[PDB]
From a paper:
HAdV-D10 is a rare serotype isolated from the eyes of patients with conjunctivitis. HAdV are non-enveloped viruses measuring 90–100 nm and arranged in an icosahedral capsid with protruding fiber proteins at the pentameric vertices. Structural and biological studies of HAdV-D10 knob protein highlighted low-affinity engagement with native adenoviral receptors CAR and sialic acid. HAdV-D10 possesses characteristics of a promising virotherapy, combining low seroprevalence, weak receptor interactions, and reduced off-target uptake.
We produced a 2.5-Å crystal structure of HAdV-D10 fiber knob and modeled interactions with known viral receptors, and SPR was used to investigate binding of HAdV-D10 fiber knob with CAR, CD46, and DSG2. (A) 2.5-Å crystal structure of the HAdV-D10 fiber knob protein (HAdV-D10K). HAdV-D10 displayed weak but detectable binding to all three receptors. The highest-affinity interaction was with CAR. Predictive homology was used to model HAdV-D10K in complex with CAR, and the position of the DG loop interface indicated that HAdV-D10 can bind CAR, albeit at a lower affinity than HAdV-C5. Using recombinant HAdV-D10K protein, we confirmed binding to CAR in vitro with a 16.5-fold lower affinity than HAdV-C5K, as indicated by the IC50 values and demonstrated that CAR-binding HAdV-C5 recombinant knob blocks HAdV-C5/D10K infection. We conclude that, although the binding is weak, HAdV-D10 can bind and use CAR as an entry receptor. Although several binding sites were identified, we determined that HAdV-D10K forms weak interactions with CD46, insufficient for cell entry. We inserted A20 into the DG loop of HAdV-D10 fiber knob. Predictive models of HAdV-D10 fiber knob with A20 peptide depict the interaction with αvβ6 integrin.
Numbering used by the authors:
A (entry chain C), B (entry chain A), C (entry chain B): 187 to 369
The structure:
Amino acid sequence: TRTLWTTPDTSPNCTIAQDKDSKLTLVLTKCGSQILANVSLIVVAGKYHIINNKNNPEIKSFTIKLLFDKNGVLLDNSNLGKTYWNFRSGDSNVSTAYEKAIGFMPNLVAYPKPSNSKKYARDIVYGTIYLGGKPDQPAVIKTTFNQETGCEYSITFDFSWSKTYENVEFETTSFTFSYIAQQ
Amino acid sequence: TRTLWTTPDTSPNCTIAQDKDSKLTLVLTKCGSQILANVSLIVVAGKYHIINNKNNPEIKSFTIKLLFDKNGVLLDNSNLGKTYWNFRSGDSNVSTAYEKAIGFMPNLVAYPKPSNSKKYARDIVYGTIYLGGKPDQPAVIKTTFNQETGCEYSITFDFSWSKTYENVEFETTSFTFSYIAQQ
Amino acid sequence: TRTLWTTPDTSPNCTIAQDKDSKLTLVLTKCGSQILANVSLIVVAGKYHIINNKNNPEIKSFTIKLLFDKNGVLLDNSNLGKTYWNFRSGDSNVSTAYEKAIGFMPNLVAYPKPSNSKKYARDIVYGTIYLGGKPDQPAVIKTTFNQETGCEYSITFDFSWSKTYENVEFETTSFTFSYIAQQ
């Protein structure tokens, strides 16, 4: 019945380019073997806050990585900030370091690490989100499972966008996906 | 009380242009701190029944708003009709039109009401349907949360389309999205 | 509360053109009135294994039919392998096979049988996925409910190859969706 969330405030809690240059809104909810994911991003400061390509054409994609361990707790090298992310209990988070996130992860069976046994997987969930909420302004949230090393589990976000966006602010829409639980 | 749904019987329950010319087969289900949600539409009379752009090239958008009070009871001036909406029980609706849908609403903190605060695009869920079942006939469904006045919560579906169609019936294909729970 | 899936042990259970020449990774979840499905396919052998639209000029579509009876028990004339498909209950298999109980099927009301009534467009849930996880290489995954014959409930998966593409192995990107349950 439980839910594990990043308090959905406008107070930043994620670093891509510079310290807390972004708030990342993710709510992950579990049912048996299937977890439902609702993600949203606002980029409040730095290089990815404003997209002007007519000056900076090279910036047409960047990536975020939620690395976990054997017990499935989020590492602090992970672009996200540890003091915002915890099992929900009303609007509060219950102000104690959690654990026991075994299962909340992308199944190693269904989504294996890139082990020497050479199979080409089908892990990737593509999608889409539009910046400002304008239709004419699309982007490609590419989410990949269990393709980062050092960790046990991993959820990486590979955002791309080809267009010639001048003073578009990086505040996405909301996108919903599910992934297969390890337990 | 697993589901606050429209009985799925394709009997018009919805007024876009004339008194009950559409059926809205919206369905919503509680997953703690998410609300997983499906939506179809059939328009079976009136100005948005058969679509001919050639003749009516300026007609390529319409809207369906739900408006909910402090207690989360669908306000009457909603496009959808109060006497078609309640919790499912088997095939009927638990034999009532209940007084407690608090918990089945879009969180204000997540998708706040209009302020002098910067409104971000994360209020919006972009998806696409297809009319008939033809690949070649898409339109956009853009659902937005708590962006409407005169109410405490609001779920507004805007249907746009961008293709010069000729004599096309507005029956759509199911879609699925989720939004974070107020409680 | 249960999940009704196939063990993702990349062990070809699905037949398209020739016996067990594909692995269909489908996983269904009771979200009460709604099922939360997540689907995938791998072609390890056959014609569809390796696609090349230069030698075979036609870009033939295909299908994957899952027919259930009055109790929701996958008939044996289906494309998938009947043995591999059950309740994990924590990714186990408790050796009991008396399964007359299942609200995992698509409501016959919200999605009727083809003959007994003129048919509407919300039979279907349209999907779009990339083969090889490459943006330039997209396909189409059309899904239909109770649109088969000599059965009681039928979730059939239509795939379509769009453009002309050369020396690609069939491995689709993950895709997520939901429908209205019978009971």
